[PDB]
Design a protein around this nucleic acid. Structure first.
Lengths: 659, 659
RNA sequence: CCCCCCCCCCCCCCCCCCCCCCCCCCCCCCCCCCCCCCCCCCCCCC
């Protein structure tokens, strides 16, 4: 029962409220308890409460005296309780309350007038209850109420008189989800003075009931409308006609199993701004299917189309000119589809597009020809995602039509080819290119020579070839910042590989084979491939097979902060290597063969750090090899994990395993 | 120039013979020298020589005085020299010689009588010379000569008078290989009193010349005849008619490119005993093709048939009943063929067969049905080799017709199935079964229950499955001796796996995964799967991932001699484990993580050995961990390899790498 | 001036074997989360 400023009593299995807490407590949490009853006589001590979070209990009934002991209470949380009876005196004396949760309270019926006398409520919750009608009063009250929740109830009708108690209130959210509503009375929503947002998730409406609902929703100020999982199989040109007279902006059609969309279906929403079609079953989209949507600014189409079936091969076809009417479209999420491929004229008309995500959108986009993105010629694209598309090859001038492209994501593909360098033609302002997890790439001396402005390059588990060319392919990228070359089994790197990239900061080189490149027995001497990068910050060199350290590799990283040498084969290290790393922060040397750590090699490294990772090391417990290290450990401030569990010696056997 | 009893001077680049050797030397070797001449005046000291091996020199001429200094000389070796002139006085005074090599001596012509006066020669060599005729005398001499070599010469004729100088000699071997002989004079071999063996390798005879030769070889005592690489494309029923009148037993037809054999071709050799057809190009063998061979006891057919060609698919077909006439056949080597498969009645009639090798004999013998070996019903087979036949499956009762089979070799196949146990039915006296290098085998509780007499089982890199069954499959083999279970990645073994096999001696278990089976943290305790084998001798347990040693596994191997624990992960070992191994001979503990070896654990192991393998061990140089070991090394007799190269410590750094 | 016979030394190519490092895939576990189901005990409501 820890309590300093807020009080929490979750998972303590209380029976009665504690009598020993600070008087000035503002937050009181008593979830996951067994309070059969809540007498108010124990609330005399607590006279400064603001929040009362006592859900997940078995409280039978409440008394008005509790309102006397809490005159400044703000939140009354009563989820999952047995308050099956409500009266006027139940919430009478409480008038300063602004929150009221009655979720899963098994309330049967509202009798006369339980909430009339108080007016400071902003949100009312009545979810998972046994209510059959929305009758919560007779006269008008709850002027300040804006959100009403009535989901998961047993309501089957919405009569006009029922909402008459909100004749002068502004409704931001009217939650009526999962209630088997089968009819709508005329004028029921016109009884609401100001209706802004409406929710009917998991409500079995269907086509005709949606027609009648839209006819009812006419001449109101609605902006939000969610009809998710309403089993709306088909829409037509008159489905949302009643929404012509309003100014709706956000509309949801997720999980509705929408098989087909009629022509000019959404012509009655000129003011729509957001529109959601995730997880549908569309088989064919027509040309004028999205007509009248010249103001949509955000469209989601994740898994909106039918998956391929071997019985019929019902591949979802998208006709040409289909997105012409989305003049102000600014975002298109188009993931997890089974579209056979891109046509020549699909995305014409998007004059203000800024985002297109195509992650796993196509079953077989084998080749990226130079005519694939011609429909994106005038669209000012900035981010393109081409992940998990099973793309096999990229031809010349594939992205030449993307003039203002800045981010390209080609991860998790099946690209096996040689980068001739003509792919990035026309990318005059490109910044990032992602190419991780491909089949194989064989770079060329001028692979990235066509894009000076590139700053990022992700090449993890891509299995590069000919990276050891005499001219360095990464040299022309005169402003590169992040480079990842992990999981590639790279064996040879040249000394002139990375000069001129003065702003390079992050270099990840884990799980490779550079053991030969650093041992002095290598012909021509060890390769010094980390020279010239003045502003490098993050370096990852774990699992390389390194057995020796050339003394002048880290001599130019004047601002290095994060270095990683785990999973290596290092046993002894030459002294005076980390001298110029004046501000090293994170050193990771786990799962190595290190047997002796001492000052003249790791002193400047241990100058001012923040994290050390030296978990699985066979240390030798000897004053020549461990004494200075344990001296450094004894007084320290570095965040070092698992020091008392895995920092165990190996030899001599007398001190085997003793920290 | 080391010389104790024999003298060797090979690869010393001598100019003249040494003058300082023991007088009683019997063997004198001076190969690979530059002796321009060999004066006899330096041979006064050497008066007890028996062998004179002075080949690979540049000796111009010899003098008869050398014979005076060596009266008991036996061997005169003069390969590759410039003795282009021979006379009667050249080998006159030498009469006790019994060996004479004149290979590659560039001898042009034999003038009058160089070898007449001496008679103790048994072998005469004249290979790689420039002789044009076999004239080596006028009268009769060389009564005791038995082998004559005349290969790689420029002889083009064999006249009858030419061999008249051997009218009363027994010729065991007449080597005339690679001489372009184009005619044969009648009576040339009848001039030889007793001709036994004849060689004509690499001689362009062809069919008709072979006919004439056989007609000439009539009425002689020949036994050996090699016609290898004679470009004999075709034979007929009368090819060897002249050999009817002799008693030939061994005949060679290797490398002759024999495309087809006529019917009843070998009907003229009732006394043949050995017969060689390796590396031929036979396309089709007829029924009566081997008629008249009822006495052949050893036949070689390695690569005797045509390989498959995609142009025509000329698969070599063997007709049925083809081996019926080989009544006394005792050995058939039948490797490296491209036979499509075995027919139902191929090997009938072999009443005394004892060996059939079928290594890589068939391109696609996918299934071993129960009717494959029906033709081998009455043949007393003892060894069968079925290696590299790409056999995919073995069905029930496949070897049921091999009543007296003792060895079965099924290695290097593609067998992926489950051994139901019915395969070995009828093998009432089987001893060894080899099954290494297969795809996958899944044993059954009664896989080997049908053959009590089995003694060997090779299962290397076979990837066994369900070896951890509750009843042990290897239990019924009540006399097993050798078991190999390497390269299988076996993970689980039961404690009741190998009881009752009291005579088991060799058990190889390398490159597996038994790390869990021995660590004490395993549920149920470590598995003691080596209990009961009283007479085990050879054990291989390298590369298993072992990290701990249960103390009572090697307690019953009272006669163990060879144990292997290399490539493991052992770091420290519990004491008193090798107590009962009173006669351990070979201990292999290379490439481990051992850091301390000392007496109470390895003392009884180091009692009386013969070989220790502890090459790559990270030792800890400390008197608690290395002092007793180096004490044991300092005085020893065990054959321990590479002690001064790889026995280097790891910690502390002061003694890193110092032996 | 030509053709051959060597001895010695230095390179190139191919094949085989062995060793080290690493990657990918798979197997045997062990651990931490997520979800579902079943069972036991206790406290209440209708």
């Amino acid at each position: 029962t820890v309590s300093h400023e807020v009080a929490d009593c979750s998972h303590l299995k209380l029976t009665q409220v504690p009598d020993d807490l600070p008087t000035n407590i503002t937050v009181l949490n008593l979830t996951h308890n067994q309070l059969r009853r809540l007498p108010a006589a124990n609330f005399t001590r607590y006279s400064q409460l603001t929040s009362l979070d006592v859900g997940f209990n078995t409280i039978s009934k409440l008394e008005p005296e509790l309102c006397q002991k809490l005159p400044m209470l703000k939140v009354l949380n009563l989820q999952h309780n047995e308050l099956s009876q409500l009266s006027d005196d139940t919430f009478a004396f409480c008038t300063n309350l602004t929150e009221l949760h009655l979720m899963s309270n098994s309330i049967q019926k509202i009798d006369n007038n339980p909430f009339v006398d108080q007016k400071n409520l902003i949100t009312l919750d009545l979810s998972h209850n046994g209510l059959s009608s929305t009758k919560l009063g007779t006269q008008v009250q709850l002027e300040n109420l804006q959100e009403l929740l009535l989901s998961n109830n047993k309501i089957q009708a919405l009569k006009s008189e029922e909402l008459d108690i909100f004749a002068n209130s502004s409704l931001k959210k009217l939650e009526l989800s999962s209630n088997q509503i089968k009819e709508f009375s005329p004028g029921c929503f016109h009884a609401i003075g100001r209706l802004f947002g409406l929710f009917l998730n998991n409500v079995q409406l269907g086509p005709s009931l949606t027609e009648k609902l839209c006819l009812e929703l006419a001449n109101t100020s609605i902006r939000n409308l969610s009809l998710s999982n309403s089993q709306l199989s088909t829409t037509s040109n008159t489905t949302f006609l009643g929404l012509k007279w309003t100014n709706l902006t956000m509309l949801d059609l997720s999980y509705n199993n929408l098989n087909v969309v009629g022509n000019d279906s959404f012509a009655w929403l000129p003011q729509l701004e957001y529109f959601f079609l995730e997880y549908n079953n569309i088989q064919h989209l027509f040309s004028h299917s999205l007509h009248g949507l010249f103001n949509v600014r955000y469209l989601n189409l994740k898994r909106s189309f039918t998956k391929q079936s071997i019985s019929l091969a019902s591949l979802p076809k998208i006709d040409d000119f289909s997105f012409q009417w989305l003049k102000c479209l600014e975002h298109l999420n188009m993931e997890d589809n089974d579209i056979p491929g891109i046509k020549s004229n699909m995305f014409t008309g998007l004059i203000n597009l800024k985002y297109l995500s195509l992650s796993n959108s196509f079953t077989s986009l084998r080749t990226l020809t130079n005519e694939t993105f011609v429909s994106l010629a005038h669209s000012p694209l900035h981010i393109l995602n081409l992940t998990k598309n099973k793309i096999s090859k990229i031809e010349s001038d594939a992205f030449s039509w993307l003039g203002h492209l800045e981010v390209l994501d080609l991860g998790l593909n099946e690209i096996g080819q040689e980068l001739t360098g003509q792919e990035w033609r026309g990318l005059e302002n490109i910044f990032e290119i992602y190419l991780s997890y491909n089949k194989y790439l064989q770079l060329t001396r001028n692979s990235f020579a066509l894009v000076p402005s590139l700053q990022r390059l992700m090449l993890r588990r891509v299995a590069l070839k000919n990276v050891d060319s005499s001219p360095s392919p990464f040299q022309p990228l005169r402003n590169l910042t992040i480079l990842d070359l992990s999981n590639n089994n790279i064996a040879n790197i040249n000394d002139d590989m990375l000069e001129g990239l003065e702003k390079l900061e992050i270099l990840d080189l884990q799980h490779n084979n550079l053991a030969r490149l650093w041992k002095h027995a290598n012909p021509g001497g060890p390769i010094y491939f980390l020279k010239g990068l003045s502003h490098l910050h993050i370096l990852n060199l774990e699992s390389n097979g390194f057995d020796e350290i050339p003394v002048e590799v880290f001599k130019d990283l004047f601002e290095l902060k994060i270095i990683d040498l785990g999973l290596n084969n290092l046993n002894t290290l030459p002294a005076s290597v980390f001298n110029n790393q004046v501000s090293l922060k994170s050193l990771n040397l786990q799962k190595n063969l290190i047997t002796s750590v001492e000052k003249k090699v790791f002193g400047p490294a241990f100058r001012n750090l923040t994290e050390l990772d030296m978990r699985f090391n066979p240390f030798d417990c000897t004053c020549e090899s461990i004494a200075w290290f344990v001296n450094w450990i004894n007084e320290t401030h570095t965040n070092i994990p698992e020091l008392s569990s895995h920092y165990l010696c190996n030899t001599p056997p007398h001190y085997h395993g003793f920290p």
